[PDB]
């Protein structure tokens, strides 16, 4: 009785939200951006190749100096690289080898990693003893850690396979805010440039916009047909892009509360593992399971170029804060640095 | 290259040395992924041989690392294990169809196309008693069991009732039919019949792992 009445109201609310989005969907991004000139062919060469991992590389994260990066591999090694000289600054042995994500603190003093052990371990890179040691082990997630991102040296947001995201206080080791609302495993999260909002992608083919300070979901975005594996904010924070197993990339708008554009091709049938934007946001870079990385014209949904240099699935990619280069990881245990030439 | 760049590059190569040494030690053990249902009894198989439960046992001075995770996403982590130990309860006819669909998802997984499965049809003592009692009929759940006859090439164990042998060969055939339905030889299933007191489970894994590695070498030597 009461349950039957309530579930009908929820369906009405879904129709209310759906009708509102169509009301503001006056035009399409393709119609708006049909006039602008195409970016041409984007040719990026492999400037560096980072060798030294002895298993599949799961995640990589650039440092804010656009020179250092951290990569996580299932050989139990968290390796910090000097991308300019390919030198290995640090090699962090992990207690559990099933690491699935890695984070680099924007200050550069810490790195974080986590996997099937349901722990987000914090490592101190600046110690008086000259070695990297574990500073905090963040326990409390009942599922595998799929993503983690630093806000500062004391705040980190982690997404887990238990369908919940969390905000942690590193000093106390306790989660200040717990984010609930996803019905599937949360696979990725992208912090906004102001670090007050963050979008998360889950296996329920939905992307949720979260308020870090408030602690509740503000908006929900749908349209994907399978699990969302990668999510990335637009440079200005008014939009984001997702990559799912349905071989499509979608550009969702926060204010319009609806999808703006889909990046798909008939030849592409494999899942999408990682997505990132260039410095200006004109180019969308997506890693696929066909071992390639496609460069998309984010405003025109045209494939501008291909980064085909890996012999296994492209598991991750990232763009430096200065936008000079893009690093792509893969299951062939190799990282490549790409940029264009005049 | 400055004076400190050289000392940094020397540090990198020392790190490279310890990375390769740790990889060599990592390859000295064979990694096994343990899977099964709640009623499988895979823990008893582990304990007799002996959120992630890990067990180490040695067979002929060869070390095995078996991971019992306590799933389409995190299963990709075990993309490069030697074998998957899928344990089922053959006595439970009600949940046999759960195992068959569970086995099919693992077998047809896109990231497990080259991983061989060591199937352990556990609890054969319970299966033998259940068939002897006759209270429950496999034909009730599987209609094709009525028209199924034991092949003339079968080799039942000595002193085994033909009713038990017919039931065992049908249960095994259901899993094998899934395995041979697809794969084209990229991976092989290794069914075995174990009980709650069998002490040869570790050696069966060792003998099956040799064939899994041997098939891996034959692809390298041939698929050049």
């Amino acid at each position: 009785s009461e349950l039957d009445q309530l579930r009908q109201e929820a369906e009405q609310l879904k129709n209310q939200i759906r009708d509102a989005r169509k009301a503001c969907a006056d035009a399409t991004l393709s119609q708006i951006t049909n006039n602008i000139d195409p970016v041409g062919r984007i040719q990026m060469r492999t400037r560096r190749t980072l060798r030294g991992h002895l298993a599949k590389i799961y995640a990589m994260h650039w440092g804010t100096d656009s020179r250092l990066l951290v990569s996580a591999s299932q050989d139990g090694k968290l390796i910090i690289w000097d991308s300019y000289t390919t030198n290995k600054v640090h090699a962090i042995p992990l207690r559990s080898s099933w690491v699935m994500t890695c984070a680099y603190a924007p200050s550069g003093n810490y790195v974080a990693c986590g996997g099937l052990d349901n722990i987000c371990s914090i490592y101190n890179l600046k110690t008086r003893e000259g070695n990297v040691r574990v500073s905090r082990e963040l326990a409390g997630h009942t599922g595998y850690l799929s993503c983690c991102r630093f806000l500062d040296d004391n705040q980190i947001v982690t997404s887990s396979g238990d369908t919940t995201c969390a905000l942690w206080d590193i000093e106390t080791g306790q989660q200040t805010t717990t984010f609930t609302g996803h019905t599937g495993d949360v696979m990725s999260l992208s912090l906004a440039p102001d670090t007050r909002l963050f979008v998360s992608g889950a296996c329920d083919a939905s992307a949720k916009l979260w308020d870090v300070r408030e602690g509740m979901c503000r908006q929900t975005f749908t349209g994907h047909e399978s699990d969302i594996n990668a999510i990335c904010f637009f440079p200005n924070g008014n939009a984001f892009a997702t990559g799912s197993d349905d071989a499509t990339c979608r550009l969702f708008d926060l204010r319009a509360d609806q999808e703006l554009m889909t990046y798909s091709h008939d030849n592409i049938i494999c899942g999408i593992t990682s997505v990132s934007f260039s410095k200006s946001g004109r180019l969308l870079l997506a890693g696929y399971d066909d071992f390639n990385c496609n460069v998309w014209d984010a405003l025109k949904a045209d494939r501008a170029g291909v980064l085909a240099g890996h012999d296994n699935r492209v598991s991750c990619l990232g763009v430096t804060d200065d936008g000079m280069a893009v690093a792509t990881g893969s299951w062939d245990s190799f990282l490549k640095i790409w940029n264009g030439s005049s | 290259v400055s004076a400190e760049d050289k000392a940094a590059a020397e540090r990198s190569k020392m790190i490279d040395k310890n990375l390769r040494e740790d990889g060599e030690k990592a390859r000295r053990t064979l990694r096994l992924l343990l899977l099964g249902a709640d009623n499988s009894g895979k823990s008893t198989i582990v304990k007799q041989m002996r959120g992630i439960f890990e067990t180490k046992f040695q067979v002929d001075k060869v070390n095995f690392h078996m991971f019992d995770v306590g799933r389409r996403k995190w299963i990709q982590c075990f993309n490069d294990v030697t074998a998957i130990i899928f344990v089922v309860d053959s006595s439970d006819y009600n949940r046999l169809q759960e195992a068959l669909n569970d086995f099919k998802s693992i077998w047809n997984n896109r990231w497990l196309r080259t991983i061989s499965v060591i199937l352990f049809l556990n609890k054969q003592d319970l299966l033998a008693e259940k068939v002897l009692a006759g209270k429950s009929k496999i034909e009730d759940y599987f209609p094709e069991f009525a028209r199924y006859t034991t092949p003339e090439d079968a080799t039942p164990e000595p002193g085994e009732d033909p009713r038990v042998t017919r039931a065992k060969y049908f249960i095994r055939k259901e899993f094998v039919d899934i395995s041979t339905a697809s794969g084209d030889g990229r991976h092989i299933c290794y069914p075995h019949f174990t009980c709650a007191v069998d002490t040869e489970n570790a050696r069966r894994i060792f003998n099956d792992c040799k064939d899994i590695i041997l098939q891996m070498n034959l692809r390298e030597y041939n698929l050049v």
Partner: single-chain antibody
Amino acid sequence: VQLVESGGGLVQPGGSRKLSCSASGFAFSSFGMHWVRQAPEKGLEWVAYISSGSGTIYYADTVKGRFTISRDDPKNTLFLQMTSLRSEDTAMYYCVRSIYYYGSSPFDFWGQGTTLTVSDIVMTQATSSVPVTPGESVSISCRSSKSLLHSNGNTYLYWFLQRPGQSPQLLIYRMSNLASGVPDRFSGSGSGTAFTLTISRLEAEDVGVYYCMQHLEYPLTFGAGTKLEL
């Protein structure tokens, strides 16, 4: 972090003496080690350097062929075997650690030092002494014969402060970066062959001798030393 030196003492000319440096409180095997001596009423002089893992060794020309530097990582001890000792070898020998990677701080820690008694790029610090008062900004200048700015963008200049009766302390590394544990009032600036160290709001603890060292290439050469006195 601790570095205790032992084995020094009075020796006859032409003899041999063994210096031991016990390391504790840090990962000794990961740090390259240096020996730096300071002759009585004189400046600092780099002697030898053994890299991490003992794979690389450098010696000063004044000691090459006569001194032997070695480390015992399991025992966390650094050794300096000295042979054919001259009267010029009478000094205080300091055990100095340095780790080299991107963004690291070499020469971050100095040992207490041991007393031994026996019976190239030039760094110029023209002003040996400077009269100073508390609360007043003090600037110290350094010069180099060769341009310390390398092609990789780094300018390898290091600043050290030796308070009277204590070991030298690293202030600035690579000419601009403030060392950990150093008050923010210290600041370094320079370009090419000329560099400056600024000490805003000078205090009593700032009294000491300031040396500028180059790390562009071996051998490592210090400055003459600038003394701040009240």
